[PDB]
């Protein structure tokens, strides 16, 4: 809703940033196995914990 703690805002911001896709140039490194970011999340299918 509208009303939020700071803590909340900051946490949400965090998870918002962390929700970006693997940058297309990381897949070109020599030592990496990572095709994609396995940890991405969609608000509709999975919910965070903030109370």
């Amino acid at each position: 809703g509208a009303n939020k703690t700071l803590n909340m805002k900051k946490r949400f911001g965090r998870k918002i940033k962390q929700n970006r896709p693997l940058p297309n140039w990381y897949r070109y490194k020599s030592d990496t196995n990572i095709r994609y970011n396995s940890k991405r999340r969609n608000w509709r299918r999975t919910k965070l914990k903030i109370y």
């Binding site: 803590n7 914990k49 903030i50 109370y51």
Partner: protein
């Protein structure tokens, strides 16, 4: 009806984030966190009780800012006030 139509009524939330352990374990009505027990002022965990816990939260679980270097400087004799010196002996 105890079922699906009942589940619609849940907008309340009994817990909030515990300053100490940061999950939503904080009980606003009881004023405690079910996990750590933040007000209690000593960590709530029952070890013999059930066994997995320490490996979830516990020493070494998150990064240890101070302790990791304690291993290393344990052997070095806990030097204070020393500076490294050149083997070349420059003066």
């Amino acid at each position: 009806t105890r079922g699906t139509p009942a589940f619609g009524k849940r907008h309340q939330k009994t817990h909030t984030l515990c300053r100490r352990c940061g999950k939503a374990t904080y009980h606003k009505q009881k004023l405690r966190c079910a996990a750590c027990g933040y007000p209690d002022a000593k960590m709530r965990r029952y070890d013999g009780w059930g066994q997995k816990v320490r490996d979830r939260k516990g020493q070494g679980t998150g990064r240890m800012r101070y302790m990791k270097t304690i291993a290393r400087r344990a052997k070095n004799g806990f030097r204070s006030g020393t500076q490294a010196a050149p083997k070349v002996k420059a003066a």
